[PDB]
Amino acid sequence: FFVKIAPIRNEQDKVVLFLCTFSDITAFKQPIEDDSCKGWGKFARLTRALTSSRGVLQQLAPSVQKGENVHKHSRLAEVLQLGSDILPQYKQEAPKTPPHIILHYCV
Amino acid sequence: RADICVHLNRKVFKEHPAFRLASDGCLRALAMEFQTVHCAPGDLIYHAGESVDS
Amino acid sequence: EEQIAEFKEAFSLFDKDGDGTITTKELGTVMRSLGQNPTEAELQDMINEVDADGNGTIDFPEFLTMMARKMKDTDSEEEIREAFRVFDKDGNGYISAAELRHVMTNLGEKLTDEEVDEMIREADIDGDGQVNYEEFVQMMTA
Amino acid sequence: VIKRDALQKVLEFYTAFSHSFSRNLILTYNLRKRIVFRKISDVKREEEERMKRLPPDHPVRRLFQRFRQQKE
Amino acid sequence: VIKRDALQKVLEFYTAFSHSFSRNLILTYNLRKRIVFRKISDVKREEEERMKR
């Protein structure tokens, strides 16, 4: 598991909650098994397990070689983005509106 | 009325695994008794000490 | 049985050309993408190991047996599943009254139609003239 | 229509009438009782099947026995 | 939400269903049960105290 840990701050600036995102590195890292019918079977199982990363995010990767250089890292980049998106701080905040827009009920 | 109630609690009965096996009559019975509450942000439902009756 | 049908996506992904036959070249490519470079001989050996026909390839049906072998369900589950299979002559996840009657006849243990109906009613909860897997499991446990 | 509880109360109040009521009132159809029947299509199918065609009896044998026991 | 009494009545009425319901419905969190835990600050304080006496 690619465990991407992150501590969450608060509206009072203190740390209160944790976050920890996961991702399967079974087929990507290396093969080990305690009991199995064959190696091929094991591989298949691994593939089945690791569908979210290899299926939708790294879908241009299965043609081109050396996925550990770019693909896995790229996948981890989602987590990195999350690191920013997992700084809302669990604070009872106002509704988030983008800039260059004025509210419906403003003064 | 029963039908209406069922329709209202479609989010309950279709999602949860409890009521998939439930009969139609049973479902109807349930629906009649099911309330629905629209709680606000920062509005607590159960308070420590209060009676857990639902 | 059910989740094995959702596996087909993986198979599709594996196939580069899209012919329903996993070539060695494709496998090699996949391996390369992953970041591991084994020899073609190894791949060939692997192919030989699982596939039944042996035409330098294999289909989803071929894989199926392997998948089944891999699975390894529970003992109770295995028993119950077998029983279910025996009951349901067609094999559509549901056991009709007629089907039940037929199976009884096959067995030898004769009973009345009314009795059978009663049994069915006892089994069922939702009331659709049929019994689910969960419903079936109710009778075997208690 | 009349709610059963109220009706029951009434019957209790008028004891001599209750018996008479019981004697008289034949329900056109009870919703309590099951009806035993087969559909014709199903029968036909069964018949059709008839012309076509022990080890797993032990898991089901127990069940059968249980059913029999229940029956009494 | 559903009031317990009504639910109980319903369950009683539909006996075969009740068992199924029991089997299925896993509460995400029981409000009856206590949780056993200590706060980290308190633990730290305790540790600090440890060295004194």
Curated annotation (Swiss-Prot), chain B:
Post-translational modification: Channel activity is regulated via tyrosine phosphorylation/dephosphorylation by SRC and PTPN6.
This protein's encoding gene: Kcnh1
Self-association state and partner proteins as the record states: Homomultimer. The potassium channel is composed of a homo- or heterotetrameric complex of pore-forming alpha subunits that can associate with modulating beta subunits. Heteromultimer with KCNH5/EAG2. Interacts with ALG10B. Interacts with RABEP1. Interacts (via C-terminus) with CTTN. Interacts (via cytoplasmic region) with Ca(2+)-bound calmodulin.
Entry's family note: Belongs to the potassium channel family. H (Eag) (TC 1.A.1.20) subfamily. Kv10.1/KCNH1 sub-subfamily.
Tissue: Detected in cerebellum, at parallel fiber synapses on Purkinje cell spines. Detected in hippocampus neurons (at protein level). Detected in brain, but not in the other tissues tested; expression is highest in granular cells of the dentate gyrus, in hippocampus CA3 pyramidal cells, and in cerebellar granule cells. Detected in pituitary.
Subcellular compartments: Cell membrane; Nucleus inner membrane; Cell projection, Dendrite; Cell projection, Axon
Record remark: domains: The segment S4 is probably the voltage-sensor and is characterized by a series of positively charged amino acids at every third position. Conformational changes of voltage-sensor are driven by an electric field generated by a potassium gradient across the membrane. The C-terminal region interacts with the cyclic nucleotide-binding domain and contributes to regulate channel gating.
Species the sequence originates in: Rattus norvegicus
UniProt protein name: Voltage-gated delayed rectifier potassium channel KCNH1
Shown residues in whole-protein numbering: 537 to 590 of 962
Curated annotation (Swiss-Prot), chain C:
Region of interest: Necessary and sufficient for interaction with PCP4: 71-142
Entry-annotated residues carrying Phosphoserine: 76, 96
Record comment: activity regulation: (Microbial infection) Inactivated by S.flexneri OspC1 and OspC3 proteins, which specifically bind the apo-form of calmodulin, thereby preventing calcium-binding and activity.
Organism: Homo sapiens
Phosphotyrosine sites (modified residues): 94, 133
Post-translational modification as stated in the protein's UniProt record: Ubiquitination results in a strongly decreased activity.
Domain of life: Eukaryota
Disorder: Ventricular tachycardia, catecholaminergic polymorphic, 4: An arrhythmogenic disorder characterized by stress-induced, bidirectional ventricular tachycardia that may degenerate into cardiac arrest and cause sudden death. Patients present with recurrent syncope, seizures, or sudden death after physical activity or emotional stress. CPVT4 inheritance is autosomal dominant.
Domain EF-hand: 2-37, 38-73, 75-110, 111-142
Phosphothreonine: residues bearing it: 39, 105
Protein name: Calmodulin-1
Residues annotated for Ca(2+) 2 binding in this entry: 51, 53, 55, 57, 62
From Swiss-Prot, chain D:
Subcellular location(s) of the protein: Cell membrane; Nucleus inner membrane; Cell projection, Dendrite; Cell projection, Axon
Region (Calmodulin-binding): 3-72
Location of region: Interaction with cyclic nucleotide-binding pocket: 29-31
Tissues where the protein occurs: Detected in cerebellum, at parallel fiber synapses on Purkinje cell spines. Detected in hippocampus neurons (at protein level). Detected in brain, but not in the other tissues tested; expression is highest in granular cells of the dentate gyrus, in hippocampus CA3 pyramidal cells, and in cerebellar granule cells. Detected in pituitary.
Top-rank lineage group of the source organism: Eukaryota
Family according to the record: Belongs to the potassium channel family. H (Eag) (TC 1.A.1.20) subfamily. Kv10.1/KCNH1 sub-subfamily.
Function text: Pore-forming (alpha) subunit of a voltage-gated delayed rectifier potassium channel that mediates outward-rectifying potassium currents which, on depolarization, reaches a steady-state level and do not inactivate. The activation kinetics depend on the prepulse potential and external divalent cation concentration. With negative prepulses, the current activation is delayed and slowed down several fold, whereas more positive prepulses speed up activation. The time course of activation is biphasic with a fast and a slowly activating current component.
Name by which UniProt lists this protein: Voltage-gated delayed rectifier potassium channel KCNH1
Species whose genome carries this gene: Rattus norvegicus
Shown chain mapped onto the complete sequence: 644 to 722 of 962
